[PDB]
Amino acid sequence: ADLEDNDETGNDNGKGGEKADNAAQVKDALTKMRAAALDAQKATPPKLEDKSPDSPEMKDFRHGFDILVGQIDDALKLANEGKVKEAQAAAEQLKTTIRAYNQKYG
Secondary structure: OOOOOOOOOOOOOOOOOOOOOHHHHHHHHHHHHHHHHHHHOOOOOOOHOOOOOOOOHHHHHHEEEEEHHHHHHHHHHHHHHHHHHHHHHHHHHHHHHHHHHHHHHO
16 A cells, blocks of 8 residues: 555665675675576577577576576565575575576576
Protein backbone atom coordinates (compact mmCIF):
# COMPACT_ATOMS: atom_id res chain seq x y z
CA ALA A 1 0.00 0.00 0.00
CA ASP A 2 3.04 2.22 -0.55
CA LEU A 3 3.15 5.26 -2.83
CA GLU A 4 6.80 6.33 -2.57
CA ASP A 5 8.88 3.52 -4.07
CA ASN A 6 9.56 3.90 -7.79
CA ASP A 7 13.08 5.11 -8.56
CA GLU A 8 12.51 8.22 -6.47
CA THR A 9 15.84 9.33 -5.00
CA GLY A 10 16.37 7.34 -1.81
CA ASN A 11 16.90 4.16 -3.82
CA ASP A 12 19.94 3.46 -6.00
CA ASN A 13 21.51 6.73 -4.86
CA GLY A 14 21.29 5.35 -1.33
CA LYS A 15 25.09 5.29 -1.06
CA GLY A 16 28.05 7.51 -1.95
CA GLY A 17 29.36 7.62 1.62
CA GLU A 18 29.24 4.22 3.33
CA LYS A 19 31.89 3.20 0.77
CA ALA A 20 32.30 -0.53 0.07
CA ASP A 21 33.14 -2.68 3.12
CA ASN A 22 30.12 -4.63 4.41
CA ALA A 23 26.68 -4.68 2.84
CA ALA A 24 27.65 -1.92 0.41
CA GLN A 25 30.42 -4.03 -1.09
CA VAL A 26 28.00 -6.95 -1.29
CA LYS A 27 25.18 -5.22 -3.18
CA ASP A 28 27.65 -3.99 -5.79
CA ALA A 29 28.93 -7.57 -5.95
CA LEU A 30 25.43 -8.95 -6.52
CA THR A 31 24.57 -6.81 -9.53
CA LYS A 32 28.05 -7.65 -10.78
CA MET A 33 26.92 -11.17 -11.64
CA ARG A 34 23.47 -9.99 -12.74
CA ALA A 35 24.84 -7.51 -15.28
CA ALA A 36 27.09 -10.40 -16.32
CA ALA A 37 24.25 -12.86 -16.78
CA LEU A 38 22.59 -10.40 -19.15
CA ASP A 39 25.93 -9.78 -20.84
CA ALA A 40 26.70 -13.42 -21.60
CA GLN A 41 23.09 -14.06 -22.62
CA LYS A 42 23.55 -11.76 -25.61
CA ALA A 43 26.59 -9.47 -25.47
CA THR A 44 29.93 -11.29 -25.14
CA PRO A 45 29.65 -14.75 -26.85
CA PRO A 46 31.17 -16.92 -24.05
CA LYS A 47 30.78 -20.70 -24.19
CA LEU A 48 28.30 -20.22 -27.03
CA GLU A 49 31.24 -19.82 -29.40
CA ASP A 50 29.52 -22.54 -31.41
CA LYS A 51 26.34 -23.49 -29.53
CA SER A 52 23.79 -21.06 -30.96
CA PRO A 53 20.03 -21.43 -30.06
CA ASP A 54 20.26 -25.00 -31.39
CA SER A 55 21.43 -27.17 -28.51
CA PRO A 56 20.05 -26.76 -24.93
CA GLU A 57 21.66 -23.30 -25.19
CA MET A 58 18.33 -21.57 -24.70
CA LYS A 59 17.36 -24.07 -22.00
CA ASP A 60 20.63 -23.41 -20.20
CA PHE A 61 20.48 -19.69 -20.95
CA ARG A 62 16.83 -18.94 -20.17
CA HIS A 63 17.41 -20.94 -17.01
CA GLY A 64 21.07 -20.31 -16.26
CA PHE A 65 20.21 -16.60 -16.20
CA ASP A 66 17.02 -17.14 -14.22
CA ILE A 67 19.13 -19.17 -11.82
CA LEU A 68 21.80 -16.54 -11.30
CA VAL A 69 19.16 -13.81 -11.38
CA GLY A 70 17.28 -16.10 -8.99
CA GLN A 71 20.16 -16.44 -6.54
CA ILE A 72 21.35 -12.86 -6.94
CA ASP A 73 17.96 -11.83 -5.52
CA ASP A 74 18.15 -14.60 -2.94
CA ALA A 75 21.50 -13.10 -2.04
CA LEU A 76 20.53 -9.51 -1.28
CA LYS A 77 17.36 -10.60 0.50
CA LEU A 78 19.82 -12.60 2.60
CA ALA A 79 22.04 -9.57 3.30
CA ASN A 80 18.82 -7.57 3.59
CA GLU A 81 17.58 -9.61 6.54
CA GLY A 82 20.65 -11.63 7.41
CA LYS A 83 24.06 -10.03 8.08
CA VAL A 84 26.55 -10.08 5.20
CA LYS A 85 28.47 -12.91 6.87
CA GLU A 86 25.42 -15.05 6.10
CA ALA A 87 25.21 -13.55 2.64
CA GLN A 88 28.90 -13.69 1.78
CA ALA A 89 28.54 -17.36 2.64
CA ALA A 90 25.32 -17.52 0.66
CA ALA A 91 27.35 -16.00 -2.17
CA GLU A 92 29.71 -18.97 -2.24
CA GLN A 93 26.96 -21.58 -2.49
CA LEU A 94 26.37 -19.80 -5.78
CA LYS A 95 29.91 -20.08 -7.09
CA THR A 96 29.35 -23.83 -6.98
CA THR A 97 25.82 -23.65 -8.36
CA ILE A 98 26.85 -21.62 -11.39
CA ARG A 99 29.84 -23.91 -11.76
CA ALA A 100 27.40 -26.66 -12.57
CA TYR A 101 25.93 -24.38 -15.21
CA ASN A 102 29.28 -22.86 -16.16
CA GLN A 103 30.90 -26.30 -16.31
CA LYS A 104 27.88 -28.05 -17.77
CA TYR A 105 28.30 -25.87 -20.87
CA GLY A 106 31.91 -24.91 -20.13
